[PDB]
Design a protein around this ligand. Structure first.
Ligand SMILES: CC(C)[C@H](NC(=O)[C@H](C)NC(=O)OCc1ccccc1)C(=O)N[C@@H](Cc1ccccc1)[C@@H](O)[C@H](O)[C@H](Cc1ccccc1)NC(=O)[C@@H](NC(=O)[C@H](C)NC(=O)OCc1ccccc1)C(C)C
Ligand SMILES: Cc1ccc(S(=O)(=O)NC(=O)NC2CCN(c3nccc(C(F)(F)F)n3)CC2)cc1
Lengths: 99, 99
């Protein structure tokens, strides 16, 4: 695809039989989601935001379809105001910024 | 150019006749920049993201060069831990997410 940026880059993501939407986010080191019935336990983490720092729940080896493409990685769950797909998962599906 | 994303996409910018580096941020609705005086009048605004909210001086019709591409737009001035060229100005230089 070749997505223009006049609106938010929200794409259909799927994860362990859960259809959702998410934000392709070139300024996000990590992928961060609001909830999902993920692999039980989670090693805790801290992530950096514009308005301070938040505590999240890290889950690894996570299979996720993004916009068609398959991806494997580290989905954090945290108090995010929108499902964010960061560079860790954007790399694998070949996603690049262009101008 | 075509920017892969294994690292942060920081680029050279020129703003207020001052050279900076700044992160190309497709999740950001607005453009946010660290302290500096710009010309013209500002008006208060709060923006929010991860961690919570910050306060900003919003400036308008602010001429800005980005990886050597000219652009007029709204630019927010406030204490971000990083300069962010969000979607408002990305649409001007013709930026797209390609995969
Ligand atoms: C996703 C995170 C991992 C990411 N943070 C990082 O990658 C940081 C630097 N690194 C990191 O987490 O590494 C691990 C760690 C941290 C420190 C040391 C060791 C361990 C991040 O906060 N990403 C943001 C940029 C950033 C990075 C460096 C430091 C400061 C800010 C935007 O790209 C990202 O797009 C966010 C997510 C998002 C998108 C849209 C909606 C709300 C939040 N947007 C924003 O912060 C922007 N806000 C918006 O687009 C609009 C204007 N506001 C909004 O819709 O907010 C309403 C909202 C606020 C409050 C609660 C409910 C709703 C923007 C203006 C800066
Ligand atoms: C391989 C390939 C090359 C070129 C193209 S394109 O057709 O010249 N450009 C384009 O289509 N832009 C927009 C429309 C489709 N869209 C999108 N693309 C993928 C996945 C999702 C979804 F649903 F999950 F959200 N949405 C937004 C961008 C296509 C394919």
């Amino acid at each position: 695809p070749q997505i223009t940026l006049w609106k938010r880059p929200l794409v259909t993501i799927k994860i362990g039989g859960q259809l959702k939407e998410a934000l392709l986010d070139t300024g996000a080191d990590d992928t961060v989601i609001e909830e999902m019935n993920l692999p039980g336990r989670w090693k805790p983490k801290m992530i950096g935001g514009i308005g301070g720092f938040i505590k999240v729940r890290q889950y690894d080896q996570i299979i996720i379809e993004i916009a068609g493409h398959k991806a494997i990685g580290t989905v954090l769950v945290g108090p995010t105001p929108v499902n964010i797909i960061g560079r860790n998962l954007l790399t694998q599906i070949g996603a690049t910024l262009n101008f």
